[PDB]
Write a structure and sequence with these properties.
The structure is cut from a larger assembly and holds 2 copies of chain A (43 residues). With 43 residues, chain A is low in regular secondary structure. Chain A is 12% helix and 0% strand. Chain A has 1 helix and no strands. Chain A has one helix at residues 3-7. Chain A is rod-shaped and about 75 Å long. Chain A starts with a helix and ends in a 36-residue tail after the last helix. The A-B interface holds A 14, 16, 19 and B 38, 40, 42-43. It is classed as virus. Keywords: Bacteriophage, virus, capsid. Extended phiCD508 capsid. Chains A, B are gp49 - Major capsid protein.
Amino acid sequence: MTFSSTSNLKELLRKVVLDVELGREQVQLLYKPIYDSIADSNL
Amino acid sequence: MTFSSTSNLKELLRKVVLDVELGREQVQLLYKPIYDSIADSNL
């Protein structure tokens, strides 16, 4: 009858999350084509 | 004997409908490529 009445009492209502992209952007390895890598552990 | 005498008596005169395009434009859902849809009855 009076959903406006029950709107304020939020804890009754279902909780659903508006899914949005959050989080820091992924990072890449840009340098690699320029550099020649040597990976001897005994350096 | 004039044809104007029989003008008013439309029942006597043969009836032919002037064929023509009547109607209204069909509406379309333009938004859909832009928006990403989430469907849930419990929102």
